[PDB]
Scaffold this motif. Structure first.
Motif, mmCIF file in Angstrom:
data_model
loop_
_atom_site.group_PDB
_atom_site.id
_atom_site.type_symbol
_atom_site.label_atom_id
_atom_site.label_comp_id
_atom_site.label_asym_id
_atom_site.label_seq_id
_atom_site.Cartn_x
_atom_site.Cartn_y
_atom_site.Cartn_z
ATOM 1 N N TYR A 183 1.124 -0.952 0.230
ATOM 2 C CA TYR A 183 0.112 -0.530 -0.321
ATOM 3 C C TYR A 183 0.961 1.308 -0.068
ATOM 4 O O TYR A 183 1.799 1.356 0.128
ATOM 5 N N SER A 184 0.110 2.574 0.306
ATOM 6 C CA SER A 184 0.789 2.954 -0.123
ATOM 7 C C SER A 184 1.049 4.129 1.264
ATOM 8 O O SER A 184 -0.837 4.699 1.550
ATOM 9 N N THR A 243 5.545 9.278 1.570
ATOM 10 C CA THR A 243 6.937 8.708 1.158
ATOM 11 C C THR A 243 7.673 10.130 1.606
ATOM 12 O O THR A 243 7.519 11.450 1.721
#
Ligand code: NA
Ligand code: NA
Ligand code: NA
Lengths: 511, 505
Positions: free
Chosen positions: B335-336, B340
């Motif tokens: 997943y994200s 980031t």
């Protein structure tokens, strides 16, 4: 049904599970030292497996230590920026100047033209050169300065591999990164000033044993060079086997000629050297010479000019002094002479290419080590190690070496050695076995921090270059650490006891 | 010729000349105070002239103090990171999450719909919201959070005007909005102890040096800060709207053919944004949780055996690190996490962190070298002048020397100098410390003065002369209002005329 949903969100589920499963450790045990142990276990678990980004995990101590009451948030913050960070900033200025003006590409092309087309000899040359250069300056400094050159060499070989017509490139990059990082075997083992751990050990031994004057340059080298060289060769073989292939007959085709022609064509395309590259090379040489001339250990350095405030000006002062000069030395004139000149590097270019993630990671490691020291956790391990007097000498040596080489996993080498020496020396003198016999393996194995980054600054500096697979680093480091421990054992059994006379109790040791 | 070569290389020649010309002081005096004064002068000259980058100048203490022998390089390095940086990281995580998922444009368009298109009402709303946010958030974090939203607002305004017509006025509006945010962040920060790190530093210093005194708390600080803060904010708004746009009398109080068209086009933009979705709401939930914990946990009461160990930075980190593991998007099938580390790295003001750390290290070297004691001794004969003139001179000096150094650095430098001075003249220590602490935050002339100014100036819409022109007036207004508040209403609450029992005789 639910199996797919568990598989897709494995990182979040693992983070929650490992936070909750180790949760009983603080509440049980009456909250005495299991809080810092729980923090260390959680952070180490997140570092081994990529459940969270490494810097995010390094930020966890700033949460756990203040809430647990181990140490205030202000102190945890103060532990995040240390002398290594100033060194890193100073070196990264030079690295930015090197890469911006394509000095690294020119050096890489010249080296490839001279020698080293075969990857095996290329890796051997990298390891040998880094190991020799790290004999004098430091592990961190040399690992930071020679890594851009190796990266440029690998990139140029990858680019020339097209030959007017992949998986190999990334594995070669990982191999180069690890061989540069793991070239600590000669850098500090061989010379007392090579690493911090070896200066601390020498100072402690001289203070505690003034009568013994055996530890000096030219005597450390005699017993340390064979072991360090054996470790270097065996680690090179192990790395060449783990990554890429190893064929005995190959080291003992038209593609090579095509690659050489492409390299020569690119080098000719580079043309004559530029003024910016000359200035960058001169500043690189000046930085290296100033690092070498701080305190060689056999001749007085320039620190004797400051022989009134000892320890005030470290290597980072040199790094900053020669790196900040890149922000003001003219590079080009905006011959129109419109407004002004431009510097060699601007702050916009320095903000990028700066491993801020590595700075955060090393700061988090420093904060975790400081939190472990603040609570009675490291002292607990040391006091547990003490009651081994009834064990045989070799078993005591093995247990101490393994404990030191596994406790330097999450703590800096100087902190580990400064912790263990006061613990081992009374234990060494309790038995009549020649306290050097137990001090030497521990200080040799302290620097064998080849597992994970942040354990050793060279590891983090090499990790900064994008090949962020921790599992590969762990796989290589386990083998390199086993080789180092075995070679240290063999040296203690064979080469060291003749000259240091480690079998009988010496006169200088207390009775 | 020679003159052209001097003209092109202004910065290099100036840096070399300033380094060389001040070398006589350390070379002749041979004292640690002289060496620290030389370092202070060099850093201040490079900060005003901006010959070197602000962070490059901030790293100069770590090169100069160890070489001069004032303190080891390890201590100087240790002085570069404080709780302010942890707070900044924790709030930059939230700001990155807000900007990435297009929440700033949604809030911007909703605000534009609510308060119309009139620039002055929008400026008032921005100032009020920024002050309310900075009441709890730090000024740097408040500016970092708020400024993208106003950037979206103004960009949409010029877009609407250009499309309705199918500029200099839009550029002036952007300048005014940037300046109003930069000032109002600090103006809101003066209201509370936790609003600025300056107030926290002053409070901890006062508590440590005067354990008997227990007057300082949230309620008292709010009571004597809110009136002055409101007056300064309103007068600064009036000054800013008069300077750039031009003053208005009655058209301000009170549809135009272009007005309904602009409202309509803003409406179609708002529907083009679409309904609120995931990767939002959770951002709002986490932000309101951050704020709620900020004014609930510290008004503690759960960690009593360890008081002061956990602070607002701990809460900021706790909420911000949740932006690195909460899933955002599906797909390796990993997943994200809504952020980031690359996104956070390309948003974190690392230069601001280095600049503030350099200020902290310079201040710490100032106390360690003994220069602060010398300054206090030289300022001791100020007892002849009356107390009001003493405090006027102190406030003017503090607000003059806060344009070069950051507010926390200036306050931590001047507290060990000012606090003995108050005791020497047999005057209430609070009577000297409170006005100085309030006037320390009045750093508006230059981007280097405080990190909010640098954040605002980083967008490139503003220029230095306009910042100087606005900051001079806002600083004059702030000094006058602080003096009036000290003279009129603060003394009856604090009984500052009489010498307190907690202060040493
Ligand atoms: Na070394
Ligand atoms: Na280590
Ligand atoms: Na300031």
């Amino acid at each position: 049904k639910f199996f797919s949903y568990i598989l897709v969100y494995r990182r979040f589920l693992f983070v929650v599970f490992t936070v909750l499963v180790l949760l009983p450790l603080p509440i049980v045990l009456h909250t005495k030292e299991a809080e810092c142990a729980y923090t260390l276990f959680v952070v180490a678990t997140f570092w081994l497996t990529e459940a969270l980004p490494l810097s995010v995990t390094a930020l966890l101590p700033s949460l756990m230590l203040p809430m647990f009451g181990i140490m205030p948030s202000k102190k945890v913050a103060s532990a995040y920026f240390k002398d290594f960070h100033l060194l890193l900033i100073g070196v990264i200025c030079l690295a930015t100047s090197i890469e911006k003006w394509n000095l690294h590409k020119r050096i890489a092309l010249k080296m490839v033209m001279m020698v080293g087309v075969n990857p095996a000899w290329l890796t051997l040359g990298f390891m040998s050169s880094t190991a020799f250069l790290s004999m004098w300056l430091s592990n961190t400094s040399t690992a930071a300065m020679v890594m851009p050159i190796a990266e440029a060499v690998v990139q140029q070989i990858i680019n020339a591999e097209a030959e007017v017509e992949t998986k190999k490139g990334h594995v070669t990059r990982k191999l180069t990164c690890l061989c540069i990082a793991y070239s600590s075997t000669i850098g500090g083992l061989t010379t007392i000033t090579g690493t911090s751990t070896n200066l601390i050990f020498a100072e402690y031994f001289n203070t505690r044993y003034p009568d013994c004057r055996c530890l000096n340059f030219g005597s450390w080298f005699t017993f340390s060079f064979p072991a360090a060289l054996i470790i270097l060769l065996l680690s090179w073989i192990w790395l060449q086997w783990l990554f890429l292939g190893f064929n005995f007959k190959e080291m003992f085709t038209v593609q090579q000629k095509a690659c050489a022609e492409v390299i020569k064509q690119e080098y000719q395309k580079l043309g004559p050297i530029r003024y910016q590259e000359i200035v960058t090379l001169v500043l690189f040489i000046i930085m290296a010479l100033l690092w070498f001339s701080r305190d060689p250990g056999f001749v007085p350095g320039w620190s004797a000019l400051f022989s009134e405030y000892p320890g005030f000006a470290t290597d980072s002062t040199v790094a900053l002094l020669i790196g900040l000069l890149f922000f003001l030395i003219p590079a080009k004139t905006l011959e129109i002479v419109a407004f002004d000149y431009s510097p060699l590097i601007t702050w916009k270019e320095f903000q990028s290419f700066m491993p801020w993630d590595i700075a955060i990671l090393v700061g988090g490691g420093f904060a975790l080590a400081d939190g472990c020291e603040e609570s009675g956790l490291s002292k607990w391990i040391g006091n547990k190690l003490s009651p081994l007097g009834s064990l045989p000498a070799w078993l005591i040596i093995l247990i101490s070496s393994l404990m030191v080489t596994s406790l330097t996993e999450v703590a800096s080498n100087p902190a580990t050695i400064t912790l263990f020496l006061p613990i081992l020396s009374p234990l060494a003198e309790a038995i009549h076995v020649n306290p050097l016999y137990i001090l030497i393996p521990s200080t040799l194995c302290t620097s064998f921090a080849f597992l994970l980054p942040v354990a050793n600054p060279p590891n983090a500096i090499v990790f900064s270059y994008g090949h962020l697979k921790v599992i590969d680093m762990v796989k290589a480091g386990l083998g390199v650490n086993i080789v180092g421990v075995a070679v240290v054992m063999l040296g203690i059994c064979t080469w060291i006891v003749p000259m240091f006379d480690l079998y009988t109790y010496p006169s200088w040791a207390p009775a």
